[PDB]
């Protein structure tokens, strides 16, 4: 459902404060540490045996920056999230073969990374605005899975 004016303002004002490179590397690293089966989807990045390996993997760090910058593009397309992500959704399904249940798990990790970097701003109402965003982005990635 559409974001209201108040949802929009929380989202738009928080995201202008976000360091996308540092939070993206953080979010991607944590998802491979918390849910270790996801490592199989990235077996081409190399060293992913333990959490030290992951935290020190330059390709994991780099990739996290792109994933979050992509996600960040939802903030300019709040009215059109499903349409904006439709090609990516295809790419995940066909080329990377990723089970769509995993998108919801990354979205939760992103909430936790944002909460830790922006505690004064990540209020109860702000957190509800972002949870709705993350639910829409995960749904738009899963949408072209046929």
């Amino acid at each position: 459902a559409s974001f209201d004016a108040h949802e929009r303002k929380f989202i738009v004002d928080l995201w202008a404060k976000v360091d996308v490179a540092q939070c993206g590397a953080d979010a991607l690293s944590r998802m491979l540490i918390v849910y270790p089966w996801k490592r199989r989807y990235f077996e081409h990045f190399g060293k992913m045996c333990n959490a030290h390996d992951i935290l020190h993997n330059s390709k994991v760090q780099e990739h996290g920056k792109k994933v979050l910058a992509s996600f960040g593009e939802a903030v300019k397309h709040l009215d059109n999230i499903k349409g904006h992500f439709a090609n990516l959704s295809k790419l995940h399904c066909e080329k990377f073969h990723v089970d769509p249940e995993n998108f919801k798990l990354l979205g939760d990790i992103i909430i936790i990374v944002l909460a830790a970097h922006h505690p004064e701003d990540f209020s109860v109402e702000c957190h509800a605005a972002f949870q709705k965003l993350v639910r829409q982005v995960a749904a738009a990635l899963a949408a072209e899975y046929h």
Partner: protein
């Protein structure tokens, strides 16, 4: 299964909440009610204001229960036996809701203790809240 290291990890991050069970507990429910408003159907009789007496008192009970769980992390089924009957048998809470409250607990620790909730600590805590959730959803029927 929780390793010895997971257990050290959970105990240590748990100790940060020691004086703040009501505070942290109330904040987690506030977050669960606002971010997953479908959870409100289980508390028809609650005042849903910020820092409501009813929410403060329930937030305390929840986190007090999670605090004994940490203190009996070897025997979670026995520590949470009565709770599992309440949730599954008497209240018939749909098992998706345990994931929502677990996520909100994690958000509270990240806000209050961002350095302590490192990635490997984050992994242990999440293992412990799945383990607690599994015990509470173990008795349907």
């Amino acid at each position: 299964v929780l390793s010895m290291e997971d257990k050290s990890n959970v105990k240590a991050i748990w100790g940060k909440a020691s004086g703040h069970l009501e505070e942290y507990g109330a904040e987690a429910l506030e977050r669960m009610f606002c971010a997953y408003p479908q959870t409100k159907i289980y508390f028809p009789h609650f005042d849903m204001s910020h820092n409501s007496a009813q929410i403060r008192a329930h937030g305390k009970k929840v986190f007090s229960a999670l605090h004994e769980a940490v203190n009996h992390i070897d025997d979670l089924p026995g520590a949470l036996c009565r709770l599992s009957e309440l949730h599954a048998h008497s209240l018939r809470v749909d098992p998706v809701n345990f994931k929502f409250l677990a996520h909100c607990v994690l958000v509270v620790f990240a806000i209050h203790h961002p350095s302590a909730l490192s990635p490997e600590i984050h992994a242990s805590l999440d293992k412990f809240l799945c383990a607690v959730s599994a015990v509470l959803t173990s008795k349907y029927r």
